[PDB]
Ligand binder design. Sequence first.
Ligand SMILES: CC(=O)N[C@@H](Cc1ccccc1Cl)C(=O)N1CCC[C@]12C=C[C@@H]1CC[C@@H](C(=O)N[C@@H]3C(=O)N4[C@@H](C=C[C@H]3C)CC[C@H]4C(=O)O)N1C2=O
Length: 110
Amino acid sequence: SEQSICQARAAVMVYDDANKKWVPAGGSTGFSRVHIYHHTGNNTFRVVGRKIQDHQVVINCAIPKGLKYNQATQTFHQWRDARQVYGLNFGSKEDANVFASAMMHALEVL
Ligand SMILES: CC(=O)N[C@@H](Cc1ccccc1Cl)C(=O)N1CCC[C@]12C=C[C@@H]1CC[C@@H](C(=O)N[C@@H]3C(=O)N4[C@@H](C=C[C@H]3C)CC[C@H]4C(=O)O)N1C2=O
């Protein structure tokens, strides 16, 4: 059904707009294995990340056509939906490059 097109190590966060600070996605600070999954049948893509320690799914969001993916730095990238701002604090530049490669690919073929 879905094919993983990358795996990247990152601390996944979401922005608490009310208190003006980042907070760990899913409630607990730590690193996750973050995929982009391609549903090849419908040509849709989503970001899915699971905490290394306990496998909790901490992010599961769609990547819509036209998304503005902000590579704020070489190791912190972020984007928006209509509700949330998501951030990936990558474990290394190599991880960031892997994920950004796949994201930019998705945004080209959507
Ligand atoms: C128009 C728009 O939507 N603009 C958005 C950005 C954007 C532009 C275009 C498309 C989509 C998006 Cl998403 C915006 O500006 N946003 C999105 C919410 C957050 C922010 C607003 C305020 C704060 C000020 C500081 C800055 C920030 O978060 N910097 C990071 C940082 O402080 N940290 C993270 C790492 C490194 C740094 C780079 C690790 C954790 C923490 C830390 O180091 O402790 N901010 C933003 O980026």
